[PDB]
Design a protein around this ligand. Sequence first.
Ligand SMILES: O=S(=O)(O)O[C@@H]1[C@H](O[C@H]2O[C@@H]3CO[C@@H]([C@H]3O)[C@H]2O)[C@@H](O)[C@H](O)O[C@@H]1CO
Ligand SMILES: O=S(=O)(O)O[C@@H]1[C@H](O[C@H]2O[C@@H]3CO[C@@H]([C@H]3O)[C@H]2O)[C@@H](O)[C@H](O)O[C@@H]1CO
Ligand SMILES: [Ca+2]
Ligand SMILES: [Ca+2]
Ligand SMILES: [Cl-]
Ligand SMILES: [Cl-]
Ligand SMILES: [Zn+2]
Ligand SMILES: [Zn+2]
Lengths: 447, 447
Amino acid sequence: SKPNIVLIFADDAGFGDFGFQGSTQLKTPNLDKLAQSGVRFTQGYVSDSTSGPSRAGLMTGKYQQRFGYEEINVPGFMSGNSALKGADMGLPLDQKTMGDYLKEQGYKTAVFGKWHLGDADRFHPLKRGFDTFLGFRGGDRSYFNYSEQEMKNGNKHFFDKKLERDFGNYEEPKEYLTDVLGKEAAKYIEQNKDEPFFIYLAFNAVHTPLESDPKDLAKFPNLTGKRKELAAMTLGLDRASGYVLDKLKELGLDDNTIVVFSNDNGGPSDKNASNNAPLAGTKSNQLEGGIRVPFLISWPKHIKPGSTYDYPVSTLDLLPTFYSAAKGKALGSDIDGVDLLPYIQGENTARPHKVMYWKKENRAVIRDNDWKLIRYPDRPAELYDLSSDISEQTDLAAKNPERVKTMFKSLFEWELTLERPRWLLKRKYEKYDIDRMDKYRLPATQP
Amino acid sequence: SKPNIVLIFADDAGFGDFGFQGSTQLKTPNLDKLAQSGVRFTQGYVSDSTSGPSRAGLMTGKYQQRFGYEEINVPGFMSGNSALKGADMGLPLDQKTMGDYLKEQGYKTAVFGKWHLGDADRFHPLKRGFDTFLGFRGGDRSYFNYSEQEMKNGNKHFFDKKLERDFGNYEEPKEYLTDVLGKEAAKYIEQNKDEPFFIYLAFNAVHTPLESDPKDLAKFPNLTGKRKELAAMTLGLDRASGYVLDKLKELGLDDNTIVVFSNDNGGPSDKNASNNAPLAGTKSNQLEGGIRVPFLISWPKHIKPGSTYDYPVSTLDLLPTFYSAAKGKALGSDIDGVDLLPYIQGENTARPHKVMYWKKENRAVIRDNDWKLIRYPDRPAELYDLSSDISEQTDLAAKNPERVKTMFKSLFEWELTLERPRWLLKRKYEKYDIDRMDKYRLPATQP
Ligand SMILES: O=S(=O)(O)O[C@@H]1[C@H](O[C@H]2O[C@@H]3CO[C@@H]([C@H]3O)[C@H]2O)[C@@H](O)[C@H](O)O[C@@H]1CO
Ligand SMILES: O=S(=O)(O)O[C@@H]1[C@H](O[C@H]2O[C@@H]3CO[C@@H]([C@H]3O)[C@H]2O)[C@@H](O)[C@H](O)O[C@@H]1CO
Ligand SMILES: [Ca+2]
Ligand SMILES: [Ca+2]
Ligand SMILES: [Cl-]
Ligand SMILES: [Cl-]
Ligand SMILES: [Zn+2]
Ligand SMILES: [Zn+2]
């Protein structure tokens, strides 16, 4: 029978900020049990170090730069010269989503929480292969209800923060947003328990603003300031994930449900006190700390519990993995991801991806097996062996000049397959991205 | 007394394709006499290796990337994702031109020939500080008249090729276009001989298409194919320049006229058989062959004949040089060029520009004294000492790693002062630009 699919996708979480990732300071008991129920990927990657492009890759199974979704869509952050601004920045309409492909296979489809794939009506999830929505079009919002005064005083971009049911039915959350999203996902499972369903549960946790349930804050008496708020927000994320995992268990659906847990980008250590241990870097740089994310898959009928998979995988792999599981036999020729199940099961012992790519303007990465070439606008290209240097502290470029040259040529060959970007950030954000990378250049460690 | 100013600006000429630049094969007797009458710059630079951005720099005295004019405006070559296309690509209206500054000093101002600073009415020379125009809005056109059928049946961009008098009075050339432009400039001098005037004579010679006066072709029986056409087109450019220089001499105006001769970008050796000897590279790359140009200034009242100046200078310097000569005392604080006259006269013995910059997307150059750092998307950054290696054959990056790092940081610091581009080329043109660079990577020789 066609399995249910639940994709749980956090925002701005630290690589080290889960029990199953080695945290003793933060508590994620429900997600730790999910990790134990299935396979944990030690080298799971997003397709970009920021939210919008990462989600564009996830939703399409494609390198998002191929359709010009290169720089992040943040209304108010965009160049005065940007081709598209405000509500016009969105996943191009000619792209086929995860939702569209699973609808073709007879699935009920729903998205809860953060969309961030366009604010205009034409970009709405209910036009992009989702039957049901409760969430917000934009990129960040309060974990509590906005007052009438806050909504009346919002700038022209503020409307994308409003919580929305299906197509334009605006309704603020009645309790802590993380709990609302988890309970709504659980209600959807209950309502659709007799048919195949796909849920995209896109928490805004643990993105700013740093707002928590006071009862969650009170569980971390020894933490202070931003770190205390992150701990409480992480406990909330884990509890709300628990509502969904517990509903699957209670209804006897979890055996034939694919549950994925991942994260849209590396932790912004300066904004939400996220910790990417043992990685260097953060959100919005292409060090491991920005692009490597917590990544779990559970499917009890096909995946051994307590297992780990150690070759690189991508969120780009999730569309073809889901589509294959849904018995799909008409996958677009343009898909960059691969079906992971044969790799997870050990039927295919090769690497899912020999070569992987990242790009924002002049900043780009080509990875070939465990060699990682990083290109920058402001310093010579660096070469890392990730098999011996997870924290990217030992530059090998000078000692491997032929490999640097061949990897440079391969990177540019891939860049020639991309469209020009559809929108551009203000110039100042490139200084911020590089300065934050240099601030977090040393390996992070568990506290 | 305020001097007359005549700026003669060729298109796509080879660095070596003039008598005064060391050609024995090509004939430029009028421009050779101009060189002998004044100062020849051995290190004269444009602000970009392509027409539009080069002209935007020339016309403003500013790094054109500071107002987003980074990639060339060619209607039909632009990305489907480009912010501006067709007639909307043009010199931003908030920029003050050479024309505007000289109009403030009580000059009559005229442009003849190629404009290429925007096709829409609002970008027209008569809105940008020019009283008089005979030329074409766009980037290239036939040296002979278009028929009514050719003009009626052109694609939607073709109208920018039509020869135009002042504001929208269309009239095709009655003779070889190079002769028309030179004679019209000479008539303007005659009509305005009793008052200060500024003429911008922007020849389309020696840009494609390769069309010549048959009488000029017949002077080069020993040359064949594209090189024979270039020789004839170059003879025409030199003759038409002669009409202007001879009119100044005949009316007794040349003593107190500043005559400048330069070129919009390096020779496209693969298109018009231009030869950039002794330089490596071409049009649309940032090797010396793309950015270094023939550069002459004559002003008999102030500049010694037969002189050479060997420190780097820029077309960016021409606006402040002209404005100072016109007795201007209110130069904008935003000007990147300097007044060259004190440097030419030896009053200021320093370099006009210690640090110079070039940029198109990932391709950029920072020059510091005679050190040149070249950044590429597809190979490690290279370092040249131009004082010992004019042809950029000996990469010194490996032996000077501290200087590579410091120059990289300085380059990026300048990039942070720029706007994002206002329009973007189709991706395929970056492959063309890099492949042509590699084809002409060796030094050119006379041939
Ligand atoms: O998680 S998001 O990427 O969506 O967060 C963004 C924003 O973060 C960005 O800010 C600029 C643009 O790209 C880089 C940085 O240079 C990225 O970190 C975040 O600061 C803001 O609070 O929310 C938006 C989403 O709305
Ligand atoms: O001299 S021009 O640059 O104005 O000539 C251009 C064009 O040359 C360009 O073509 C693409 C875009 O940038 C590079 C190259 O990658 C530059 O060489 C030339 O081929 C064409 O014939 O005329 C246009 C101007 O209309
Ligand atoms: Ca995020
Ligand atoms: Ca040109
Ligand atoms: Cl951030
Ligand atoms: Cl060309
Ligand atoms: Zn005279
Ligand atoms: Zn004289």
